[PDB]
Amino acid sequence: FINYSSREINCKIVYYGPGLCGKTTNLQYIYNKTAAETKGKLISLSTETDRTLFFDFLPLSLGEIRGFKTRFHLYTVPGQVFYDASRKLILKGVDGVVFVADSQIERMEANMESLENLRINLAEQGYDLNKIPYVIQYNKRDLPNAVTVEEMRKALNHRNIPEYQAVAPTGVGVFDTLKAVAKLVLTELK
Numbered sequence: 001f002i003n004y005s006s007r008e009i010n011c012k013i014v015y016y017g018p019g020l021c022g023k024t025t026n027l028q029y030i031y032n033k034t035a036a037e038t039k040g041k042l043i044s045l046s047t048e049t050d051r052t053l054f055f056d057f058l059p060l061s062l063g064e065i066r067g068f069k070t071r072f073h074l075y076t077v078p079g080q081v082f083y084d085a086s087r088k089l090i091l092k093g094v095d096g097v098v099f100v101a102d103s104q105i106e107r108m109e110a111n112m113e114s115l116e117n118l119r120i121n122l123a124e125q126g127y128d129l130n131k132i133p134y135v136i137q138y139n140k141r142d143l144p145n146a147v148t149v150e151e152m153r154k155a156l157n158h159r160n161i162p163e164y165q166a167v168a169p170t171g172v173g174v175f176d177t178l179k180a181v182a183k184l185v186l187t188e189l190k
């Protein structure tokens with residue numbers, strides 16, 4: 001999304017996953033551990049029905065595509081967002097998507113049905129997941145109730161697609177996940 005006069009194209013990175021998985025902790029480790037003269041301000045919106053969390057920033061690797069740099073955005077939905085007309089609204093012209101799956105055995109049947117939603121909301125909006133940048137981040141690895149990744153690749157990453165093992169409050173692969181989707185969108189931009 002080029003802005004002509006402002007001479008700075010904008011991309012769309014979204015974090016998808018079940019209710020309480022690691023989308024909010026992901027953006028915090030990023031914004032809460034960066035520098036002001038690059039990023040904007042962390043916006044948190046909320047109503048009695050739905051919630052939205054998002055921020056904007058300038059990368060630290062690029063400069064000129066047509067003589068201009070990109071300015072990625074990270075959009076998400078904290079908590080158990082009931083209504084599906086807000087999660088359809090969060091994918092309004094998405095460029096790259098990250099799937100924060102919860103390694104928790106308790107909510108392992110929760111990742112499947114949440115992935116099914118991403119696989120049914122995008123094709124509805126004219127987006128095929130196999131071409132539109134999509135990465136998966138296996139979070140909550142520290143918890144001793146968590147399943148082996150060998151099983152998560154079999155059940156959630158059926159038609160792989162790059163994967164990343166991460167732990168959100170320690171920062172493990174929070175930024176390492178983002179750097180993968182970034183280049184995947186940057187390549188699909190010329």
Ligand SMILES: Nc1nc2c(ncn2[C@@H]2O[C@H](COP(=O)(O)OP(=O)(O)O)[C@@H](O)[C@H]2O)c(=O)[nH]1
Nearest residue numbers: 019020021022023024025078079139140167168
């Ligand atoms: N131990 C641990 N806790 C995590 C991890 N990721 C998220 N959490 C916790 O899980 C809870 C819900 O996650 P949060 O990101 O805040 O909300 P979400 O936006 O609905 O996924 C919070 O208490 C987080 O601290 C992780 O990798 N390890």
